[PDB]
Design a protein around this ligand. Structure first.
Ligand SMILES: CC(=O)c1cnc(N[C@H]2O[C@H](CO)[C@@H](O)[C@H](O)[C@@H]2O)s1
Length: 158
């Protein structure tokens, strides 16, 4: 089991860390969602599906910088909604193919009423998301840590 980003940055068997740089809608009004769709950015696969079934959760999601201070967050994992920053590990999604499959995570970030002006700064860390991978075969329990960075400033109009 291993994963990669849309630009080919890999985290190999056994886990590890990678940075993911995302373009963000540059203007987001109070009452709208800023959507960070990681399912187009992070992909994973099973290396031995003949024998092993892989299980994958979002173990934790943490907010940083302007997302921590200026937004109210929800994460969707395989379509189901949970608070972000997270309060529990999600259910498991099965990976049973060598073909790359999206990691089905998206963040929905809506401005808090006090937000105004530059609410996220270009180049800043906005989230750390931990993918936890286990299987039905041995004791492997690995973390794939995704550090999510903003490519651009985001303004909440005033
Ligand atoms: C041939 C053989 O013994 C093995 C091949 N890969 C192994 N193991 C690797 O791939 C598995 C399937 O994605 C994962 O469950 C393991 O955690 C590990 O990533 S053991």
């Amino acid at each position: 089991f291993a994963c990669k980003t849309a630009n080919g940055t890999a985290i190999p068997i056994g886990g590890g860390s990678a940075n993911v740089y995302v373009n963000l809608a540059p203007v987001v009004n109070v009452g709208q969602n800023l959507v960070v769709d990681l399912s187009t950015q992070i992909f994973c696969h099973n290396d031995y599906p003949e024998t092993i079934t892989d299980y994958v959760t979002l173990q934790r999601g943490s907010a940083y910088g302007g997302v921590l201070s200026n937004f109210s967050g929800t994460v969707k994992y395989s379509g189901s909604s949970y608070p972000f920053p997270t309060t529990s590990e999600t259910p498991r999604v099965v990976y049973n193919s060598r073909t790359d499959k999206p990691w089905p995570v998206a963040l929905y970030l809506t401005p808090v009423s006090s937000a105004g002006g530059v609410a996220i700064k270009a180049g800043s860390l906005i989230a750390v998301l931990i993918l936890r991978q286990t299987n039905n075969y041995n004791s492997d329990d690995f973390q794939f840590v995704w550090n999510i960075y903003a490519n651009n400033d985001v303004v909440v109009p005033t």
